[PDB]
Amino acid sequence: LDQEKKIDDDASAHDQLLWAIHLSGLDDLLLFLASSSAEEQWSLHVLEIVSLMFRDQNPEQLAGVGQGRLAQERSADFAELEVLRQREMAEKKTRALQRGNRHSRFGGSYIVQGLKSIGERDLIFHKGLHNLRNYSSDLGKQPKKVPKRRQAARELSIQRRSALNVRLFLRDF
Amino acid sequence: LKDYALEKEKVKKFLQEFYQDDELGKKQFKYGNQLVRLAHREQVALYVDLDDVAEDDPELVDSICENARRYAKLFADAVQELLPQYKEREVVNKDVLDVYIEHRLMMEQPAELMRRFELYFQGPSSNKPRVIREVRADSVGKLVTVRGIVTRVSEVKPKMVVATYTCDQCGAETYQPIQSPTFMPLIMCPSQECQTNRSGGRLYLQTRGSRFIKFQEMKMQEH
Ligand SMILES: [Zn+2]
């Protein structure tokens, strides 16, 4: 998937090959082997085949599918794009108000009278006046560098959806 | 070499005791009067005349004429040491740079930053003017007199004398006196708290605190 980098509802290599299984009719033989009693020695292999096929689709969303999904995805995607744009706009404006209006070399300096330093005397503040509205002294500091072996576990996988043709075939099977 | 401490005391004696039969022979001690005006910030520069020094000590005049730079520094320090004795009055606050100095005093309670006067020599009447061709390399460092025509002059520019920095974390201040035609500025705080904790505070230079002087460049040519 790191090589393919495909958008949802497009067919990966696995998807295209799965569709080819349907197009060949090979799936019917899996159902014969699974349903016929005397073929039990092959049924153990068919379990691995079937479980290998369905890996990308969870059963709940797979049960959800239906013929009207085209308009549903189209309309929903326009709505998702709308809220995404709106969120970026809002966050931008908060940052814009927090920053001062005059350019970055306009200068100035203030003493916070009575607020002592780590040293013996009051704090001297060099940044813009507006920044004191939400002040915390740690804002200038970089994060602590972790050791290599100190890092926690992480996921090597991500959620996906296959092409609608594949989804419909998988639901039928 | 001479003991410059003894020379300092001799210079002090000259300033304290010399009178030119001055103010129409009333013997009012010209340099003492000047020190009063300097102490009360009425006046900035002081031109010491070497003909006056010659009345008491011609060997001192000869000592000044060669390696003049030492005696420039010496006379300046002598004047700074004697100035409080001729003060009697408190001066009104009139300058932002001195408002910073006043705040510094209020918070505290180098000398170069406070030394708001200039000291210059007026050449002895023995020394005839040289032409620009006769100032050869045997005169390096010596006091000289030259005569000619001016050709070009620049505008007045601010020349840096001592820089003043502030620290973002510990709230302290630092100073850096300037003497060479170039220098390199400071970056990170050398104070013990920042250093021991390795807290990494940076230094910001303050044009409201540092000291500047009027500077101008000129060229002169032979007749
Ligand atoms: Zn510091």
UniProtKB/Swiss-Prot annotation, chain A:
It comes from the Eukaryota. The modification Phosphoserine is found at residue 109. It is found in: Nucleus; Chromosome. Signal peptide: none annotated. Expressed in all tissues examined including brain, heart, lung, liver, skeletal muscle, kidney, placenta, pancreas, spleen, thymus and testis. Highest levels of expression in placenta, pancreas, thymus and testis. Plays an important role in the control of DNA replication, maintenance of replication fork stability, maintenance of genome stability throughout normal DNA replication, DNA repair and in the regulation of the circadian clock. Required to stabilize replication forks during DNA replication by forming a complex with TIPIN: this complex regulates DNA replication processes under both normal and stress conditions, stabilizes replication forks and influences both CHEK1 phosphorylation and the intra-S phase checkpoint in response to genotoxic stress. Monomer. Homodimer or homomultimer. Component of the circadian core oscillator, which includes the CRY proteins, CLOCK or NPAS2, ARTNL/BMAL1 or ARTNL2/BMAL2, CSKN1D and/or CSNK1E, TIMELESS, and the PER proteins. Interacts with PER2. The interaction with PER2 is direct and via its second PAS domain. Interacts directly with PER1 and PER3. Interacts with CRY2, CHEK1, ATR and ATRIP. Interacts with CRY1. Interacts with CLSPN; the interaction is required for leading-strand replication. Interacts (via N-terminus) with TIPIN. It is linked to Advanced sleep phase syndrome, familial, 4: An autosomal dominant disorder characterized by very early sleep onset and offset. Individuals are 'morning larks' with a 4 hours advance of the sleep, temperature and melatonin rhythms. Belongs to the timeless family. Residues 1182-1199 comprise a putative nuclear localization signal; nuclear localization is required for the regulation of period length of the circadian clock. This is Protein timeless homolog. It comes from Homo sapiens. The lineage of its organism: Eukaryota, Metazoa, Chordata, Craniata, Vertebrata. The chain holds residues 173 to 345 of 1208 of the full protein.
Curated annotation (Swiss-Prot), chain B:
It comes from the Eukaryota. Belongs to the MCM family. It is found in: Nucleus; Chromosome. O-glycosylated (O-GlcNAcylated), in a cell cycle-dependent manner. It comes from Homo sapiens (Human). This is DNA replication licensing factor MCM7. Acts as a component of the MCM2-7 complex (MCM complex) which is the replicative helicase essential for 'once per cell cycle' DNA replication initiation and elongation in eukaryotic cells. Core component of CDC45-MCM-GINS (CMG) helicase, the molecular machine that unwinds template DNA during replication, and around which the replisome is built. Component of the MCM2-7 complex. The complex forms a toroidal hexameric ring with the proposed subunit order MCM2-MCM6-MCM4-MCM7-MCM3-MCM5. Component of the CMG helicase complex, a hexameric ring of related MCM2-7 subunits stabilized by CDC45 and the tetrameric GINS complex. Interacts with the ATR-ATRIP complex and with RAD17. Interacts with TIPIN. Interacts with MCMBP. Interacts with ANKRD17. Component of the replisome complex composed of at least DONSON, MCM2, MCM7, PCNA and TICRR.
